[PDB]
């Protein structure tokens with residue numbers, strides 16, 4: 360049967376790119392104040408700029424909202440590479456290109472920050488879509504999606520199609536371009552090809568999953584599978600890169616270098632810091648390997664795999680000269696906090712966050728970048744034993 364798309368009202372509601380984030384339009388307050396909001400599956404707070412900042416063109420003005428409620432409590436969120444801090448309250452919230460509902464939700468009004476807002480990103484706040492366990496300051500602060508489900512008939516599921524262009528976008532192009540879809544309350548069949556395969560959500564905190572096998576061009580990385588999930592593996596639209604635990608990163612980069620050895624790149628490239636450039640149109644995709652992550656299936660002793668191309672893990676960037684060369688950064692990097700399946704991974708796939716059934720679905724994205732010879736893939740099943748043992752305790 361032909362694939363019908365039954366969520367037209369939400370298709371194409373995102374903008375952005377992997378390096379700066381994908382965002383959706385929201386409104387807060389009465390009368391509605393429009394803000395662009397980063398979709399972040401790796402955190403659980405709805406937090407919006409609420410005071411001037413050099414990188415904000417607008418911000419939430421609580422004094423202008425008749426429906427604002429002050430919770431008279433602060434929240435401070437320091438993290439590895441930045442901080443956000445603010446004041447808790449509630450207000451009415453809508454998603455214009457979302458379900459036709461308005462809900463009362465917690466909002467952290469950000470008053471101070473450090474390397475949080477991104478120059479030219481076009482977003483003014485973040486929508487943490489993960490679970491209450493990791494909400495700040497504590498799990499009593501109900502996340503937005505939990506409020507949405509509790510207050511409306513919206514089904515307890517959302518799905519993301521993040522669409523990488525495969526080439527750089529400036530602020531102008533990125534403002535005019537469709538960056539993907541967030542389907543609130545359903546699955547839109549127009550956004551993917553082939554079958555959806557589901558992996559269990561291991562625990563409802565982050566969107567935690569279990570990786571059971573890794574291959575580079577079909578060659579097994581051959582690590583103890585616990586290494587792949589040390590100390591967790593998560594799906595995080597608020598991270599650019601595929602991030603891998605130190606040991607796994609070292610093994611993966613060794614293998615990717617070996618596969619790509621017909622061309623030599625500086626250390627700075629492999630450290631994700633330095634761009635590589637080729638003459639227009641000549642990027643040698645074929646010398647770079649595909650990468651497969653096998654995920655625990657829903658059936659006992661079954662796994663499936665997702666396969667990405669260099670068109671996913673090489674992130675398009677602009678040159679210093681803004682030349683006609685095609686340039687990229689290596690978007691795989693080291694983690695000390697587990698595997699992070701970030702935006703560059705997610706760009707390969709339509710990802711279904713099936714909270715109701717405690718599972719995450721993957722299918723090949725209708726908007727993934729590929730070439731005439733290779734495409735991204737989601738394939739199964741494989742017989743895989745002792746998969747629970749891959750999880751870290």
Ligand SMILES: C[C@@H]1C[C@H]1CNC(=O)[C@@H]1C[C@H]1[C@]12CN(c3ncccn3)C[C@H]1CSC(N)=N2
Pocket residue numbers: 377378379380381397399400401402403404436438475485487493495595596597598599702
């Ligand atoms: C793809 C986009 C270009 C990337 C920029 N990403 C971001 O600015 C992300 C929103 C942030 C955070 C908000 N963070 C946090 N940690 C604990 C509790 C609440 N918030 C951590 C911080 C980094 S990782 C993450 N998923 N979310």
